[PDB]
Design a protein around this ligand. Structure first.
Ligand SMILES: Cc1cc2nc3c(=O)[nH]c(=O)nc-3n(C[C@H](O)[C@H](O)[C@H](O)COP(=O)(O)O)c2cc1C
Ligand code: SF4
Ligand code: SF4
Ligand code: SF4
Ligand code: SF4
Ligand code: SF4
Ligand code: FES
Ligand code: FES
Lengths: 108, 230, 66, 117, 28, 207, 54, 427
């Protein structure tokens, strides 16, 4: 628009669009929503039964290593009918990319 | 039956034949910036601060006071609306004193909760600022009529509900004041109720006057017992 | 009694939560299990206003001084 | 531009430069300031009580820069070390005394440094 | 060419015929 | 200047002449009744005609005539230009300065009035009656910078008229209510005649 | 400073002449900015490791 | 356009200036065929003005044959009135107080004739208070004919015959716009309404009326009388008829002028009779209209005729029909700056665009006439003129952009040399 406004690029906005298209195509037992963040990051909603396998799919592979766990965190949210929000975060050291795993839960 | 299907922002909504652009756009959940329009009063068009760019038209209209014809495209956010709201609300912020250290509506005033959200970014005047003088009305209403965006909202109050016809519009052009021409005091019941109506810091409270700014108070609702209706 | 600071016990005293709806409003006072009392939402009259009705031939709404 | 003991300046021949506009208390991050104004009898509004803890004071420089009328100034003297917690609470009529023990010190500083900010 | 003498204009012959008035009502 | 009243004369008084009350009958007969309700533009101006400048007690009087609130009258008298509230003179002179009158050599019909008269510019005379203002937009800029008076106007101005109209009114004469020189009938002057005749066969309304 | 003044405060010699400068000096010190919703994460090279904010 | 004329003859729509100005017996032109005109119905006159398609001389288009027939509701239960203007608010107009000067009998000729088209009840004409001697003779001109049994309340031969009620303002505003006149006809302060509520023939005094100009109804007798096949006389097929002019500014004889459509101003202004300034090799910088038209230099406007689209082919058209020039001695910036100074002393004060936007300019236009410090304020002053169009209610918002917006055009070294002089003087 002008100076002092962040310039975007459509390169990573297309690649990270195209990459995680087939993380919902090849495990459609667990992944129930994927959305692309506008600042070139990926979120992927995962049912809490798929806490171990979709990590385990990522953990070793030829196309998506993601071998560094940067940050595990947790957010609480009243008025959701399922309170909390567990958010995983990983790092593709071969590829320089990020993806977050947002698994909802409850107390009990 | 008896409605016009009118498209706001490219989205349908069904309004009565005879509402306004203001109320219809307030049905789908939008607030055009309002100055000269309170609900419980009459309607005037004398600040020109709702400017909707109606689609497929050269001109720009006021959404306060016009009907809604057969189904328009009420296009709120465009590149001609946003050149008008930014242009009207640089005008009135010129002839205006530089308070908000000491003016008592420093928490809510609508030259301040528009002018971050809508409106401009910097000033170009760069000297001027006419300065009229104050007076007294009563020992309830501190009156500093320097501030005065001249929206004619307090004047339509008196001719309305509180039926004492006492205030007026005195002058021509830039030279006009608002208050009573003779030194008559204005006092009845409902006389101190104008200091909610007044949208800037001209009419402000006399006993409360200089105590506390309104981001610190703790609002708890309650019911008052001095009278019949509660 | 050294300055005038309005000191206090009552350790809750500053808690507002923001719930989205009535349906999930009362669904939190029970799960932790304390009593409550519910207000109501109030939305105004729709209503009928029309500029141009301020000028009459035999009606009573006719404004001046503008 | 050093930070230290607090002060309240005043105009040429005195006016107590403060106007109780309530901003130096809304951006203390630590909520030290405690202002309670009142309409003073002449008509111009002033403070009655003004309280700065010297223990919750985290020494930002957010009071120094929020003030429109240029009054409350972090003054350049680290002379401190009192012996009682009952003492480091400041009133209004400490700060003025502490702000008129020098103004030859402070006004030599601000005249050098107002050109940047 | 006369500052006064408006009764020659106003009410001299325009008072005999107004006409009529009927002018309606509008009480209000 | 200001537009407020610091209590010179709340009760002046100023009541009308019984010749004037019957002229109020004719004005109300014109307007349709009910929305008649304000004949304030001839009625208040008739009060100016009796006095010459109307104080605040005149404004309170006409409210009782027309049963209006008084603030409905204080308002209207302070908008229009012709009404006078400060005291005035016997001859209230108007020098019509505008853009084309500036082009029509107002420069000598400017000051050199004060060199002719001896007062301050834009100001009343110090003694009684000469009060000088300047107005805009009355008719002909096709004439010279014309000077209106309280009953007429003086077309074709010049410093000789400044040497005359100021001079002859100090003795109380009538300095030519019209064009003092030039064309008496404001004609094209080279197109003025145009063969004066009956207008070429009236009666095309057969159609 | 970032120029567009909804994020930076203005100069001290600017909030003292003009009118539009107090309304963005005052109200940028009673309340803060207004930032749109949505999460984020980042990382820099802190001199012993990272430093990330979610 | 035809044959580039627009002549001047004696077969005109005016009676005569020097013949007789007092009361009279309505010799040849006035009251020639009196009752036979209004003997027919309204549709004989409705659309009859389409033979001219008279655009209207108030200061806009929207033809006066169309506003009387169309945009005219038949009846519901309430009366109707006529409001004839007579106020001349554009500076240096003089189109009025010349019609009232020598031909006052013609205005009541088509007052009763024009009101038959609407079927209105009464007639309210509105004269400026400042014109008092001419308006004194107007009420005398009533009693010459109206009192003589020719008009009202059933005269002559028809059930439709009515009066004319003369009022006066004082120093008002309501010249330049309607809907402030029907407010000031009441008694309120004349701060105008919105122009499309329900516009002026829906919501009026208490019941819907019309607003016309002096020669919008003064030509209406003879245009219904002569008609033709003459009503398209000069100009192109856009505008038709003959309109009244005036010559002011710098001339040997600034005088009243009468002509028809689309005459070139190079031969029209020099004629009748002297062009005493520089006819050529001076500037002869001309203004098309009264106040709603900015400057033009010695360029193609002298080759351009006076058609409505001829000036609209240029940057700004005008319907006030007022000509003012400034060739050599006058400063260009100095004259028009006192025309912006004019608008501060007439403007209403309701809308925050006009009020406190003109005074943004009048404070700084007086700086440019002085010659002062650094430029590029001009484009800022150009933007503010670009920022009052649809913002105000009445035309005086639109009539205050135009003398600014055209002075900023057409003229590069206006103050680029003047402010240079003060920048050199301070140096
Ligand atoms: C700059 C300007 C000046 C005007 N001056 C007058 C005037 O002096 N007298 C008048 O009756 N109308 C004047 N008008 C236009 C009024 O709006 C007009 O009288 C009204 O719209 C009726 O127009 P009509 O002739 O088509 O009936 C002026 C308009 C403009 C833009
Ligand atoms: S008191 Fe001031 S803000 Fe309120 S209506 Fe009057 S002028 Fe407007
Ligand atoms: S009324 Fe508006 S402009 Fe005046 S001090 Fe208050 S917020 Fe500022
Ligand atoms: S120094 Fe400034 S912020 Fe602090 S009390 Fe005084 S006026 Fe208010
Ligand atoms: S230095 Fe910072 S924390 Fe301490 S009193 Fe000042 S603003 Fe508050
Ligand atoms: S242009 Fe502006 S000031 Fe003039 S009448 Fe219209 S709204 Fe009022
Ligand atoms: S914005 Fe209040 S008048 Fe249109
Ligand atoms: S404007 Fe001054 S005489 Fe026409």
């Amino acid at each position: 628009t002008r100076p002092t406004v962040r310039p975007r690029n459509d390169v990573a906005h297309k690649q990270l669009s195209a990459f995680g298209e087939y993380v919902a195509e090849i495990l459609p037992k667990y992944v129930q929503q994927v959305q692309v963040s506008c600042f070139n990051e990926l979120e992927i909603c995962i049912h809490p039964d798929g806490v171990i396998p979709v990590l385990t799919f990522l953990r070793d592979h030829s196309n998506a290593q993601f071998k560094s766990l940067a940050d595990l965190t947790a957010v609480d949210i009243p008025t959701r009918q399922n309170r909390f929000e567990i958010v995983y975060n990983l790092l593709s050291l071969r590829f320089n990319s990020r993806i977050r795993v947002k698994t909802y839960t409850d107390e009990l | 039956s008896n409605l016009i299907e009118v498209f706001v922002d490219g989205q349908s909504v069904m309004v009565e034949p005879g509402t306004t652009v203001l109320q219809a756009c307030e049905k789908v959940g939008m607030q055009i910036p309002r100055f000269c329009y309170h609900e419980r009063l009459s309607v005037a068009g004398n600040c020109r601060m709702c400017l909707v760019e109606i689609e497929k038209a050269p001109k720009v209209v006021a959404a306060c006071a016009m009907p809604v014809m057969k189904g328009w495209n009420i296009l709120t956010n465009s590149e001609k609306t946003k050149k008008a709201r930014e242009g009207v609300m640089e005008f009135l912020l010129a002839n205006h004193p530089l308070d908000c250290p000491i003016c008592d509506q420093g928490g809510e005033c609508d030259l301040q909760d528009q002018s971050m959200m809508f409106g401009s970014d910097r000033s170009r005047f760069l000297e001027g600022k006419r300065a009229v003088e104050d007076k007294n009305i009563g020992p309830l209403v501190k009156t500093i009529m320097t501030r005065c965006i001249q929206c004619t909202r307090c004047i339509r109050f008196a001719s309305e509900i509180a039926g004492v016809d006492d205030l007026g519009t005195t002058g021509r052009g830039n030279d006009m004041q608002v208050g009573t021409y003779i030194e008559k005091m204005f006092m009845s019941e409902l006389s101190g109720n104008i200091i909610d109506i007044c949208p800037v810091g001209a009419l402000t409270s006399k006993p409360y006057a200089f105590t506390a700014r309104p981001w610190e108070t703790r609002k708890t609702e309650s019911i008052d017992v001095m009278d019949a209706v509660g | 009694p050294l300055m005038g600071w309005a000191s206090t016990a009552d350790p809750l005293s500053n808690l507002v939560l923001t719930f989205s709806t009535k349906e999930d409003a009362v669904a939190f006072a029970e799960k932790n299990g304390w009593s409550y009392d519910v207000e109501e939402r109030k939305v105004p009259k729709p209503k009928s206003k029309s500029y141009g009705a301020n000028f009459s031939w035999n009606k009573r709404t006719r404004v001046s001084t503008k | 531009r050093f930070r230290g003991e607090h002060a309240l300046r005043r105009y040429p021949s005195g006016e107590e430069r403060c106007i109780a506009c309530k901003l130096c208390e809304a951006v203390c991050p630590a909520q030290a300031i405690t202002i309670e104004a009142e309409p003073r009898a002449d008509g111009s509004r002033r403070t009655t009580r003004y309280d700065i803890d010297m223990t919750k004071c985290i020494y930002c420089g957010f009071c120094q820069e929020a003030c429109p009328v240029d009054a409350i100034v972090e003054g350049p003297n680290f002379e401190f070390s009192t012996e009682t917690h009952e003492e480091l609470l400041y009133n209004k009529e400490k700060l003025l005394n502490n702000g008129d023990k020098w103004e030859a010190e402070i006004a030599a500083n601000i005249q050098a440094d107002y050109l940047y900010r | 060419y006369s500052t006064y003498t408006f009764l020659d204009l106003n009410l001299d012959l325009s008072k005999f015929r107004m006409p009529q008035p009927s002018s309606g009502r509008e009480s209000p | 200047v200001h537009r407020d009243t610091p209590e010179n004369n709340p009760e002046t008084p100023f009541d009308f002449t019984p010749e004037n009350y019957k002229r109020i009958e004719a004005i109300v007969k014109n307007y349709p009744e009910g929305h008649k309700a304000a004949a304030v533009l001839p009625v208040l101006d008739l009060a100016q005609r009796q006095n010459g400048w109307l104080p605040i007690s005149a404004m309170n009087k006409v409210a009782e005539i027309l049963q209006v609130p008084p603030m409905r009258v204080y308002e209207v008298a302070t908008f229009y230009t012709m009404y006078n509230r400060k005291p005035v003179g016997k001859y209230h002179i108007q020098v019509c300065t505008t853009t084309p009158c500036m082009l029509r050599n107002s420069d000598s019909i400017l000051e050199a009035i004060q060199k002719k008269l001896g007062i301050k510019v834009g100001e009343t005379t110090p003694d009684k009656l000469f009060t000088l203002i300047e107005v805009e937009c009355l008719g002909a800029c096709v004439n010279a910078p014309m000077v209106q008076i309280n009953d007429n106007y003086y077309e074709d101005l010049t410093p000789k008229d400044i040497e005359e109209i100021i001079d002859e009114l100090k003795a109380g004469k009538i300095p030519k209510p019209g064009p003092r020189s030039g064309r008496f009938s404001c004609e094209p002057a080279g197109g003025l005649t145009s063969l004066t005749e009956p207008p070429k066969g009236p009666g095309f309304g057969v159609q | 400073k970032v120029d567009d003044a909804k994020v930076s405060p203005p100069k001290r010699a600017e909030m003292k002449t003009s009118m539009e400068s107090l309304i963005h000096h005052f109200k940028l010190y009673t309340e803060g900015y207004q930032v749109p919703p949505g999460a984020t994460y980042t990382a820099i090279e802190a001199p012993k490791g990272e430093f990330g904010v979610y | 356009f035809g044959s580039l004329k627009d002549e001047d003859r004696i077969f005109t729509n005016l009676y005569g200036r020097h013949d007789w100005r007092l009361k009279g017996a309505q010799s040849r032109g006035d009251w020639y065929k009196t009752k036979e005109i209004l003997l027919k119905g309204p549709d004989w006159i409705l659309g009859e003005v389409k033979t001219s398609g008279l655009r209207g001389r108030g200061g806009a288009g929207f033809p006066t044959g169309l506003k009387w027939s169309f945009m005219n509701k038949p009846s519901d239960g309430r009366p109707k009135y006529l409001v004839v203007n007579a106020d001349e608010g554009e500076p240096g107009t003089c189109k009025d107080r010349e019609i009232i000067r020598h031909d006052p009998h013609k205005l009541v000729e088509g007052c009763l004739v024009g009101g038959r088209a609407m079927g209105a009840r009464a007639a309210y004409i509105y004269i400026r208070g400042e014109f008092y001697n001419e308006a004194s003779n107007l009420q005398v001109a009533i009693r010459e004919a109206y009192e003589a049994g020719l008009i009202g309340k059933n005269a002559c031969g028809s059930g439709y015959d009515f009066d004319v009620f003369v009022v006066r303002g004082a120093g008002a505003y309501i010249c330049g716009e309607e809907t402030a006149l029907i407010e000031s006809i009441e008694g309120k302060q004349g701060k105008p309404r919105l122009k499309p509520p329900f516009p002026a023939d829906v919501g009026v005094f208490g019941c819907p009326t019309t607003v016309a100009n002096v020669e919008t109804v003064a030509v209406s007798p003879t245009i219904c009388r002569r008609g033709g096949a003459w009503f398209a006389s000069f100009g192109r097929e856009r505008n038709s008829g003959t309109k009244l002019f005036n010559i002011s500014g710098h001339v040997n004889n600034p005088c009243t002028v009468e002509e028809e459509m689309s005459v070139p101003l190079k031969e029209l202004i020099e004629k009748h009779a002297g062009g005493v300034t520089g006819g050529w090799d001076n500037l002869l910088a001309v203004i098309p209209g009264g106040s709603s038209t900015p400057l033009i230099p010695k360029s193609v406007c002298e080759t351009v005729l006076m058609d409505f689209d001829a000036l609209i082919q240029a940057q700004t058209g005008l319907g006030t029909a007022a000509v003012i020039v400034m060739d050599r001695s006058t400063d260009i910036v100095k004259a028009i700056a006192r025309l912006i100074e004019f608008y501060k002393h007439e403007s209403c004060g309701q809308c925050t665009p006009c009020r406190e936007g003109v005074d943004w300019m009048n404070k700084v236009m007086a700086r440019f006439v002085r010659g002062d410090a650094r430029p590029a304020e001009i484009d800022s002053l150009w933007e503010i003129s670009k920022q009052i169009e649809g913002h105000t209610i009445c035309a005086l918002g639109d009539g205050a952009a135009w003398p600014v917006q055209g002075l900023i055009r057409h003229f590069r070294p206006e103050l680029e040399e003047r402010m240079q002089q003060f920048a050199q003087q301070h140096q």
